[PDB]
UniProtKB/TrEMBL annotation, chain A:
PANTHER family: UDP-N-ACETYLGLUCOSAMINE 2-EPIMERASE. Its EC number is 5.1.3.14. This is UDP-N-acetylglucosamine 2-epimerase. It is an enzyme of class 5 (isomerase). Pfam families: Epimerase_2. Keywords: Isomerase, Nucleotide-binding. UDP 1 binds at residues 39-42, 66, 239. It comes from Thermus thermophilus (strain ATCC BAA-163 / DSM 7039 / HB27). The keyword Kinase does not apply. GO terms for molecular function: nucleotide binding; UDP-N-acetylglucosamine 2-epimerase activity. InterPro entries: UDP_GlcNAc_Epimerase_2_dom (IPR003331), WecB-like (IPR029767). It comes from the Bacteria.
Amino acid sequence: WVKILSVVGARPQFIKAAAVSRVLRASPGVREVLVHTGQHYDDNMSQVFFEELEIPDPDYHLGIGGGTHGQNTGRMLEAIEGVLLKEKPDWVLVYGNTDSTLAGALAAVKLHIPVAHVEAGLRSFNRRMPEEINRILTDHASDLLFAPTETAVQNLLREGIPENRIHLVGDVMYDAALHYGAKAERKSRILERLGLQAKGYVLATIHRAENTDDQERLRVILEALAEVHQEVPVVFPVHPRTRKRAEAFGLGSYLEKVVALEPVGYLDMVMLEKNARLIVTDSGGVQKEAYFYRVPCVTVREETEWVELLKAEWNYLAAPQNAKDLALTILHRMRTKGVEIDLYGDGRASQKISDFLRKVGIR
Amino acid sequence: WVKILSVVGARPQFIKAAAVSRVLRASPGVREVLVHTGQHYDDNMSQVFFEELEIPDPDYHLGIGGGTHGQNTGRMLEAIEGVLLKEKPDWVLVYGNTDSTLAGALAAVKLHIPVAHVEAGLRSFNRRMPEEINRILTDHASDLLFAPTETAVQNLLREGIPENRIHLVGDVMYDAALHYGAKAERKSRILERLGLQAKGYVLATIHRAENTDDQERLRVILEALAEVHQEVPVVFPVHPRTRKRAEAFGLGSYLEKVVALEPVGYLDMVMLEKNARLIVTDSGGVQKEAYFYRVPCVTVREETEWVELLKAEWNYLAAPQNAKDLALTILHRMRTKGVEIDLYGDGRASQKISDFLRK
Ligand SMILES: CC(=O)N[C@H]1[C@@H](OP(=O)(O)OP(=O)(O)OC[C@H]2O[C@@H](n3ccc(=O)[nH]c3=O)[C@H](O)[C@@H]2O)O[C@H](C(=O)O)[C@@H](O)[C@@H]1NC(C)=O
Ligand SMILES: CC(=O)N[C@H]1[C@@H](OP(=O)(O)OP(=O)(O)OC[C@H]2O[C@@H](n3ccc(=O)[nH]c3=O)[C@H](O)[C@@H]2O)O[C@H](C(=O)O)[C@@H](O)[C@@H]1NC(C)=O
Ligand SMILES: CC(=O)N[C@H]1[C@@H](OP(=O)(O)OP(=O)(O)OC[C@H]2O[C@@H](n3ccc(=O)[nH]c3=O)[C@H](O)[C@@H]2O)O[C@H](CO)[C@@H](O)[C@@H]1O
Ligand SMILES: CC(=O)N[C@H]1[C@@H](OP(=O)(O)OP(=O)(O)OC[C@H]2O[C@@H](n3ccc(=O)[nH]c3=O)[C@H](O)[C@@H]2O)O[C@H](CO)[C@@H](O)[C@@H]1O
Ligand SMILES: [Cl-]
Ligand SMILES: [Cl-]
Ligand code: NA
């Protein structure tokens, strides 16, 4: 009856989409079309998520990826528009803040197709971040804004977005963690294969462009991880951009001084996060995931969007300026806990989102 | 030296860049680089402005136009990104609110090149207009905002954009009218070849998507204008978009019933605006221009971005609901006038901008 077309491109977008897609598939008023831009294309970055989270094959795969901002965004814009003219959906759902997100929103909004932004209103206040551009422009292009936190609500209101278009629904990635938890615990044997026990390692992920594209920042990080490793084993699934940059900069050797893995699937990843002594990341989603599992976290950035984690003291910023301090901060915070607090809703964000889409009516 | 790279695609943008470039051309410590996206390509929509306004040849011409929103915008984003990578400017300047404008900003922001928006903060609150989306996304992507009006300023502040990034400089298209008026006087002979008497006609332009793509709205307008023509001749430079939609909906006879022209150069157009009894338009520029020459204006839309013109009684909104209502509104308004008031500044917006960019 109502057709809702989702646009996904990259790993974190398949996980969110998994959770929301489940509710939309199950809903009777609702046919879904999934468009995968091709932004993430390696099997351990894309395929594995579709398999392990039980997502059906995309209705479209545009096969666009590996280019500049300008190539990727631009080619995505044109190709998504193509799909949209054929499919003529009632809603376009875009997720998060990848180049794929912005391309989806821009494609839709000029065709007068209502766009709903899942994970809306987050701000880094750091415009050099491409993801800051993406979420600002996406949000102002959107008709519905599904905010995960009250901070995000307040950001949107401050940018003069009407309250009637903003919905605090919490976080679908919490829905996903809750839902897929039993499957992870049953199926992952990553601890076994690595020979690791509960709380006998630190988990690390790093891929922010601002960390990977600057040789000195990256060196600071790899070196701090290696030092940390001497005291507590460090498990490092390595983003494909991070590996490419490490290699290009001649930092290959630093990956040998830790337990460096290829990108892992969600199920393995849950298990690593759950059983870590501490998570160190520059990832958006991992910051929250650490909090889900009540594991202290260190964010290797000058800022985070998820400021509630800092207030609650589950998270702590440590910009990579010298390996000495970064290593020290990590080992110190390894001993901390934040305060008890519920964030991110009740794990039924996707259900709230589905309901608001079905019941908004024609303008 | 500061490298300022201007991105322009459409007629209105050439006219603004004309005013801004003359100032930067003759400014110490500034190299100007101009990219033409190719969005307007016809000689009567593009080349004629470069020629008559003495705008230098573009350093680059990306040759993109005539496609969808998606196609135009997408190819311009990739192409403009190409040039920026080769030129590495200190600033990107974008103008107005066309698809070219958005591509330009978006290309630049992702390379961490600062973007200045010339004519920032205008709002129609008609979110469906592709120009509203364009100016909103652009304003939010820009680092400097050159607002032409106080309302444009209040619009930005309401959207959370901080005061220290907003400069009220007035309107460069005012600058342009001043500078080129004289030349329009000596070189324009359009009244001669059309055989019109000064104040012997009404001037019309229509090209908003929401008027042209909607058969019934376009019908009301060409109907209404033909009835106006029975009473006072109607002179109608027909935008190419308008011509094609009119022809598509089999409305081309209403065009022949009035004095329907291909698009004309800025010089002819200045003449026509100056010497019209009243101007009927859905253009943005042309409504300001009508006030410049104290010619009463009727704006064939449900709203305007330039609210000060309604308030000053120089302009009057007339939604295209009914051919006869629209025509009577036009015929009525032509023996009206607005109040004594100076808008859009001193004719030195271009220099105020040029100044903020070196500083
Ligand atoms: C900083 C930033 O803007 N980030 C935006 C960004 O996501 P992100 O930074 O989280 O990238 P990412 O960490 O690759 O994926 C995490 C997931 O991978 C899983 N994960 C991670 C590593 C791994 O080896 N295996 C695995 O399953 C983890 O378990 C976890 O579930 O794109 C997102 C999107 O557009 O949807 C936005 O929502 C984000 N915005 C925010 C604000 O968080
Ligand atoms: C409504 C809207 O969004 N409009 C935006 C739009 O401009 P616009 O509607 O004025 O298009 P347009 O009317 O073709 O050109 C006018 C010029 O053509 C001259 N003109 C007109 C007809 C003609 O035959 N010959 C000629 O020289 C006239 O002398 C006049 O100088 O794109 C502009 C841009 O991105 O820079 C935005 O600043 C505008 N935003 C605003 C707010 O005005
Ligand atoms: C601009 C943008 O949208 N950035 C997002 C992108 O980062 P990410 O760094 O993956 O951004 P891109 O999609 O531009 O990929 C960058 C580079 O990674 C390599 N590559 C990428 C994918 C793949 O399957 N194989 C591969 O080798 C290529 O060298 C490619 O050029 O996804 C991340 C999640 O994982 C998000 O946090 C980022 O916000
Ligand atoms: C979406 C967009 O940016 N719209 C702007 C564009 O409208 P405009 O209507 O020109 O928008 P486009 O640039 O998409 O052109 C639309 C159509 O006009 C025809 N065409 C255009 C140019 C040309 O030289 N020859 C030709 O034939 C083509 O059929 C083209 O597909 O410029 C106007 C100024 O004139 C601005 O008021 C509009 O905001
Ligand atoms: Cl990662
Ligand atoms: Cl026109
Ligand atoms: Na369904």
